[PDB]
Amino acid sequence: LVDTTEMYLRTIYELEEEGVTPLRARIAERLEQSGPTVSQTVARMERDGLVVVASDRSLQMTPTGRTLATAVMRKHRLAERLLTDIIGLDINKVHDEACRWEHVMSDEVERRLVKVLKDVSRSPFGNPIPGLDELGVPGTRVIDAATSMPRKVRIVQINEIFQVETDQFTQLLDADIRVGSEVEIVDRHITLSHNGKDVELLDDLAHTIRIEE
């Protein structure tokens, strides 16, 4: 979705990146938006806890805001790589096309691009592609990763240390399910199959085991 917020957050990231103080007028200018429009939007992003207008009058992205900004930049850059390296779009048209593609490319498509692309170190324009670590190329929780249709993944972590209920610890071991184990999943109780064994997790384990796509 063409979020103006995403556009504003990656504009700030760019400015910082060029060593430019992320001031409002600079953003109004870069974004071809008026100062008032910008002010209205910044005040909005503030309500969302994505940015803080410093005493300096510079825009300080909050941690969550910086995480989104980064993700948007990563998508933009992976998209640029796709466009130049595979599709072969005129280099002169690559940037603007990517500016549009950064708002619609899913994390799922990004991971495949990291896979099919020869090198995702940097953008065709020279800047490095950020957030590759956060994309995962820690881990998606089984709870959120549990699809109604079975799927296979790699256990990133078990988090036995944070468990109060330990009655399924041996189930996992008998089932041969450990960190790095490729297992089947599905929604319903949440079942985690592997080595012939099916482990129907309980709430706590379901919210703490993290599956890598």
Domain ranges of the chain: 1-71, 72-137, 138-211
Helix, strand counts (H, E) of the chain: 10, 8
> How, if at all, do strands 151-157 and 210-212 pair?
antiparallel
The domain made up of 72-137 has a fold known as Diphtheria Toxin Repressor; domain 2 (1.10.60)
User: What token pair was written down for 164?
Assistant: 């109060």
Tally of CA atoms within 13 A in the half-sphere of 17 that contains its CB: 15
CATH architecture assignment, domain 1-71 = Orthogonal Bundle (1.10)
Residue 189, Cβ neighbours under 10 Å: how many? 12
Please provide the DSSP assignment of 55-116 as one string.
TTSBEEE-HHHHHHHHHHHHHHHHHHHIIIIII---HHHHHHHHHHHTTT--HHHHHHHHHH
Q: Give the gyration radius of the chain's Cα atoms.
A: 21
Distances (CA, A) of 122 to 2, 73, 75, 137, 164: 24, 11, 12, 15, 44
Candidates 116, 199, 115; CA nearest to 155 is 199
H-only helix segments in 91-202: 91-101, 107-116, 132-135, 142-145, 169-174
CB-based contact 103:170 (threshold 8 Å)? no
Q: What is the CATH code for 138-211?
A: 2.30.30.90
